[PDB]
Design a binder for this molecule. Structure first.
Ligand SMILES: Nc1ncnc2c1ncn2[C@@H]1O[C@H](COP(=O)(O)OP(=O)(O)OP(=O)(O)O)[C@@H](O)[C@H]1O
Ligand SMILES: Nc1ncnc2c1ncn2[C@@H]1O[C@H](COP(=O)(O)OP(=O)(O)OP(=O)(O)O)[C@@H](O)[C@H]1O
Ligand SMILES: [Mg+2]
Lengths: 350, 192, 351, 192
């Protein structure tokens, strides 16, 4: 029902630098509910299902997109983690409990429950692995993918009645999983290697050949976009599972400009967090526009996405924070470009 | 006979000749009289290393009494063409062609050993035949003399006139004298 | 009142010598954690975020000692864990959620105190992968453990038995958010120095232009570790997501000969004081010469065991004396000399 | 024909030529007339061992009748540049260049067999051409003679004047006589 522009506008407020990924999610979710509104498919042809795969690097807003999307949509939104999921009958967990969690959010209403969405974080972690002699059995792996795949194909899942008595009572509330959007998001670390090995032309040796230096070899951006089902199978994913997820939203590592906005534009930005911390001590914190550029540059080198920003701030402010409480008559502290490099010390106003 | 050495890597032990093992470390050996066949071998090594890593610097150990000019130009053009900087080290001696290649190295990366002996002379050639043909070959070699001197002046930094005066007759320069002339930048006395 | 970092550092200085950088990071983290607890996020629109610390350091450098000393002055509940015991979900070994159960015990079933608590995870390097590749076979004690900690570090509700875990329908597991639970992961990443050296040091060839150090002028482990970056940890085996959860990185330095000498007498619980008390209760006084302490430091450094090496030298030097000392009579004092450490001269005794 | 020997290692048995097997133990063989080609081989062997272990001492057996000066200087400069102490040994004989390299070894690690014969002489050379060119080339050999004598005094410890007088003509020195002169430090009569 919500227009894609409305969905993109809401995500843009909380997500920065993922315009391409946001477009796919808005279009995909809009088409999904649109199909649910109509019935019989309006023709013999079968309208392909919309299942998104949020593949992206660390700190790229994969979890943020799913969490912020739930706020806009009134439909029930549940979040699960593949790490906890295990084969049925084991101490770890059961995949069927995911449906029960969705009901609790929607008050067990089968009608509205079918219109809910699911976000399975850390999906790559359960990638298929070879057998280990020491381990008794591989509970996590392809076995968990089969249970999740069954829900995508469309199957009714029995749910206990709000924690019924010892006697089962055979309520087994049924909820179809064909119309339930199944979003699976994970950061496939190491996938770049297999993708590069397949699309790498190679460097020639002759005078007229093209030499490829390590500087311009490749990057995570523009490489994951060429992902295909065959490379994902090598990672360990089941081919049937990949086929059931036609929509693929690939994120790119945040740029210097994008990181600069995150430092100040969000309400819960890192800079605002420290400003409030210093304010609790009776001092005000000010960040110069030039300092933000250096912090973004250092964070990009760390390759930890947004989380890298906190490392730079904590390191630069480690010395001042240690001595600032013991110090007196200091009312204002300022940080500049020189402080980020480390050659200079944080400026103090008395 | 060339001795063989064993290189230990994660893949496993590998056997290389003493020259190939150094080639893996971006080291090319220029030894003996310069000629067409040896020059093509050096050219193939420069191109091969360029592909492996065009950023790292290549090293060239020059110990030769000189040779053919045409073969040397193939090496000189190859060095300037490829992106990697070529570091030239003089061991034992470096004659006219060896010196031209020595000074042709990357600015700041040209080295020479203390007891090395450098010699630079003008090109020498000869032709037998009709007077008309002599005038042609005589003009061609003069062009090479001027062309070679123009390139030496660029790397050494000396004036073209100064190069012409010194190259008129065989001139022997020691390692410290070469530094002043501009053929090399520094001397490698001891490992630091 | 609110203790300042300097006051907190003074306590650490009493027990830890030479780890000035680790003390500053730990003191600042506790100060910020206390401030967040003092004024909750509900006070203003801003939602303050925590910063986890990664205590990298060689053996016997004081990593574990700092955690123990920290608990002495931490009014907030604190607990220590072992990464080796932890295993991924679905295996008989252990579960990451057990860590929260241990912390909940200290708070006496107080969810509020447990949520705003500090946790220490020693031997975090043990669960590191072998290579940059993810894995070849399932790793129960490895990346799998790191994969489960991601939700715990960032923050997720943790199910734990309320009291006794019995007689309760569905076990009535308590849900405690771990978003505010500071996590300090200290480990001795053995072999990380060579990884950093690979990128930091270049030009390792055979020719004249190569770089040869002869193992004497090479950078030490402490110097190399200080230049550690996240990319280096990827090759060692740490998951990229796990590193992001730990922005702050603290590097401890190798104990020098001078530092070891101070540890013998300066700290409250010193090696010399330990043996001295052993003699005091038996009716003997133990005296160590200043030169003797210096000699012990040199021998201990060669062992490569850090502070623990000092114990080995003292035990061997006093091996014979302790064996025959009880049989001896009229023993009121003993003195150790530099020669005693070398073994040339028997330690002096006062009759 | 060089024989092949088997080396037993943890990984397994490996086949090595007699010369390569000894190279693994930091042993370099100098044999025959010195020249640019064999000199570059020795230089590569020296640099290779330096990378493997720059602390361990290298050994250089010298059994040669002499040769080109320039090729020898490449070996001499290489031995002094690298950090490892080069222990020179004299087997059979050591002529002008063999002796200059022999005495160039690290102080206290120069040896010679009891029946070896050492010989030192001034450089030999010649040139044919114009008188002007003759003067140029004549001045170089004089500098080489003075430069080579200067280095011999540094290693042997004898005065420069004495080296000039003794090196004016071919002088043969037995193993014990060489110890007194300073070319070598000790004699290896039997294994202790
Ligand atoms: N595009 C973005 N815009 C603003 N903030 C972001 C963005 N991406 C990440 N962040 C910040 O990073 C923190 C966590 O990000 P998130 O969990 O979404 O990363 P992720 O994609 O889940 O990485 P991983 O999957 O490897 O854990 C959030 O608190 C958020 O402030
Ligand atoms: N900086 C220090 N000052 C004083 N004593 C120390 C210091 N570091 C270590 N020690 C001594 O070493 C003993 C154990 O050290 P600790 O367990 O903290 O090392 P560790 O870093 O945990 O080693 P590992 O990394 O191998 O676990 C303590 O009893 C303590 O006396
Ligand atoms: Mg420990």
């Amino acid at each position: 029902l919500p227009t894609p522009h409305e969905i993109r506008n809401h995500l843009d407020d909380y997500v920065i630098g993922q315009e391409q990924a946001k477009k796919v999610l808005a279009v995909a979710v809009y088409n999904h509910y649109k199909r649910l509104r109509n019935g019989d498919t309006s023709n013999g042809v079968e309208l392909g299902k919309s299942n998104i795969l949020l593949i992206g690097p660390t700190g790229s807003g994969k979890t943020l997109l799913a969490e912020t999307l739930a706020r806009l949509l009134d439909v029930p939104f549940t979040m699960a983690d593949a790490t906890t999921l295990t084969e049925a009958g084991y101490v770890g967990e059961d995949v069927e409990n995911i449906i029960q969690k969705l009901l609790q959010k929607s008050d067990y209403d089968v009608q509205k429950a079918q219109r809910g969405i699911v976000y399975i974080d850390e999906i790559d972690k359960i990638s298929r692995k070879s057998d280990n002699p020491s381990i008794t059995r591989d509970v996590s792996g392809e076995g968990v993918q089969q249970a999740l795949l069954k829900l995508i194909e469309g199957t009714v899942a029995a749910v206990p009645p709000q924690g019924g008595r010892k006697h089962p009572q055979q309520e087994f509330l049924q909820v179809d999983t064909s119309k339930i959007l199944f979003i699976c998001g994970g950061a496939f670390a190491g996938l770049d290697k297999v993708i590069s090995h397949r699309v790498e032309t190679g460097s020639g040796i002759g005078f007229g050949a093209t030499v490829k230096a390590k500087s311009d070899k490749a990057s995570e951006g523009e490489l994951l976009a060429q992902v295909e089902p065959e490379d994902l199978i090598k990672f360990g994913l089941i081919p049937e599972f990949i086929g059931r997820l036609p929509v693929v939203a690939t994120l790119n590592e945040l740029s210097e400009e994008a990181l600069i906005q995150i430092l100040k534009e969000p309400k819960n930005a890192l800079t605002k967090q420290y400003q409030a911390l210093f304010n609790l001590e009776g001092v005000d914190l000010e960040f110069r526009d030039e300092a933000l550029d250096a912090i973004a540059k250092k964070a990009m080198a760390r390759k930890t996405g947004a989380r890298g920003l906190r490392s730079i701030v904590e390191a630069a402010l480690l010395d001042t924070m240690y001595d600032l409480p013991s110090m007196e008559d200091v009312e204002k502290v300022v940080i500049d470009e020189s402080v980020i490099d480390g050659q200079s010390e944080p400026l103090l106003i008395y | 006979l060339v001795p063989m050495v064993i290189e230990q890597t994660s893949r496993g032990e590998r056997s290389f000749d003493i020259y190939s093992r150094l080639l893996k470390e971006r080291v090319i050996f220029l030894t003996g009289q310069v000629e067409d066949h040896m020059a093509n071998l050096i050219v193939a090594q420069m191109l091969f290393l360029e592909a492996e890593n065009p950023e790292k610097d290549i090293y060239l150990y020059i110990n030769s009494p000189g040779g053919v000019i045409t073969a040397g130009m193939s090496i000189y053009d190859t060095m300037q063409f490829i992106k990697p900087d070529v570091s030239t080290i003089c061991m034992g001696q470096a004659a006219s062609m060896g010196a031209f290649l020595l000074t042709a190295g990357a600015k700041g990366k040209r080295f020479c050993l203390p007891n090395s002996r450098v010699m630079i002379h003008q090109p020498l050639g000869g032709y037998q035949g009709q007077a008309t043909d002599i005038e042609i070959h005589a003009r061609e070699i003069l062009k090479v003399k001027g062309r070679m001197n123009e390139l030496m002046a660029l790397h050494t930094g000396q004036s073209l006139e100064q190069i012409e005066r010194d190259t008129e007759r065989d001139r022997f320069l020691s390692a410290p004298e070469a530094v002043e002339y501009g053929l090399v930048d520094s001397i490698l006395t001891h490992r630091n």
